[PDB]
């Protein structure tokens, strides 16, 4: 019951070429405004709102690390997960400081400036690298989404832009959230940032999945929420 | 014959995603700079050096119009061509001004800037659309790259970044250059902009039946030649 037809089984098409190489903007572009805001909210959550602990699990990390940059300030161990091994390869390749890795330095640096500009990029990248000890398959369709890997129960589950990437129906989303509950201590945080399933459905789904919302903000809209498992 | 593995039968991968949405700073500065240089160059070649006339044919246009922006000020009519029908369809969305089309604004603005702001963006897009009359499939391995479609001989043939997209071997390149000649009036201009061995390109253009007027590094090269 997914609606999205953008996948790693899709062919590269001409519009993909255009977007990679002939897109230009300013800090005032729509697209750049969204990323600005995501980064601001992750900073606010993990640095200003008190979301911290021993262990955080990112569910649907794709090939991306920007979503962990503030998070490595507040968590001793981070675990990154995605269903697709090809995404995992991008992450591993960056985590090992391999030369084929994507260059995040511009985003890293931006995040440093946001945090009470102290730190320079290389130290931030080191800390995130020190923090992640495991890169894993996840399938949230299963009641044990990390499978047979044994993980202590976690203090935070994070997930960014998975609705936007898959467009699942309401029941699929629900089931996914309920299954993530299995990874989390009682009282542990769930942090979600995603695009709009509308506001009332997202809340309903989070409640029914077994979580109490403490913060929910909306800005086609980008939402952000923090909740705790009962 | 060709060494590039990047085609529309490739599958989208995680690096393509990353490059669409997270590519900033130095890697993307370089691209803006490379593109600014091409634009300046086409401005030089078409608006300053008097490469002009009635008919220009762009060979291997891709899904892209940036390479025509200055050309439409010097040519009454432009014909855009590419082997891939998917490219043609992307160009058509933009020419027919459909709202699903790609937004070229900041490239259009940058060219209006290079031309002393005589004109504002929309007027410029209008001049380009009015100038493009036909969108045609082309196959440069054939003696008549345009098939059964007959055009008068052009004043100029333009080709942008095709060596870099396909990585042909030399003879393949030389024979394609010759087959293109068939579209061009005697004495007509060939303008190539591509990735760079300098003499290999030079020898290919000579052998294909052209005289080089100007060659320049901007390794990205630019070259104006004339059909013998």
């Amino acid at each position: 019951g997914f609606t999205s037809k953008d996948t790693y089984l899709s062919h590269f098409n001409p519009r993909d070429y255009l977007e990679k190489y002939y897109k230009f903007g300013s800090r005032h572009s729509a697209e750049s405004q969204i990323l600005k805001h995501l980064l601001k909210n992750l900073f606010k959550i993990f640095c200003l709102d008190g979301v911290k602990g021993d262990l955080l699990i990112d569910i649907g990390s794709g090939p991306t690390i920007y979503q962990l940059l503030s998070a490595c300030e507040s968590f001793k161990e981070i675990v990154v997960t995605d269903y697709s091994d090809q995404n995992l390869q991008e992450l591993e390749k960056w985590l090992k400081k391999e030369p084929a890795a994507f260059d995040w330095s511009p985003v890293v640096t931006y995040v440093c400036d946001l945090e009470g500009n102290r730190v320079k990029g290389p130290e931030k990248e080191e800390k995130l690298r020190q923090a992640v000890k495991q890169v894993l398959k996840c399938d949230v369709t299963q009641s044990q989404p990390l499978g047979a890997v044994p993980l202590p129960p976690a203090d935070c589950v994070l997930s960014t832009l998975c609705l936007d990437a898959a467009c699942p129906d309401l029941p699929t989303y629900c089931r996914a959230l309920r299954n993530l509950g299995s990874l989390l201590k009682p009282g542990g945080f769930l942090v979600i940032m995603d695009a709009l399933l509308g506001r009332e459905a997202v809340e309903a789904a989070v409640k029914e999945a077994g979580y109490t919302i403490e913060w929910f903000e909306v800005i086609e809209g980008l939402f952000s929420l923090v909740a705790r498992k009962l | 014959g060709f060494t590039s593995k990047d085609t529309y039968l490739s599958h989208f991968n995680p690096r393509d995603y990353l490059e669409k949405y997270y590519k900033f700073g130095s890697r993307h500065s370089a691209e803006s700079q490379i593109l600014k240089h091409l634009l300046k160059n086409l401005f030089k070649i078409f608006c300053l050096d008097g490469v002009k006339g009635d008919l220009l044919i762009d060979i291997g246009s891709g899904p892209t119009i940036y390479q025509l922006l200055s050309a439409c000020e010097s040519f009454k009519e432009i014909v855009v061509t590419d082997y891939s029908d998917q490219n043609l369809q992307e160009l058509e969305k933009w020419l027919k001004k459909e709202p699903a089309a790609f937004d070229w604004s900041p490239v259009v603005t940058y060219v209006c800037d290079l031309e002393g702001n005589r004109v504002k963006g929309p007027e410029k897009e209008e001049k380009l659309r009015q100038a493009v009359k036909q969108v045609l499939k082309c196959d440069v391995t054939q003696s008549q790259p345009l098939g059964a479609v007959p055009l008068p001989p052009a004043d100029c043939v333009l080709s942008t970044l095709c060596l870099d997209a396909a990585c042909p071997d030399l003879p393949t390149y030389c024979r394609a250059l010759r087959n293109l000649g068939s579209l061009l009036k005697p004495g007509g201009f060939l303008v190539i902009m591509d990735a760079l061995g300098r003499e290999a390109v030079e020898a290919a253009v000579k052998e294909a039946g052209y005289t080089i007027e100007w060659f320049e590094v901007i390794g990205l090269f630019s070259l104006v030649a004339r059909k013998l």
Binding site: F2, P63, D82, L161, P168 | -
Partner: peptide, 8 residues
């Protein structure tokens, strides 16, 4: 599969 996330 999706760019990030389920089987696709």
């Amino acid at each position: 599969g999706f760019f990030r996330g389920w089987p696709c």
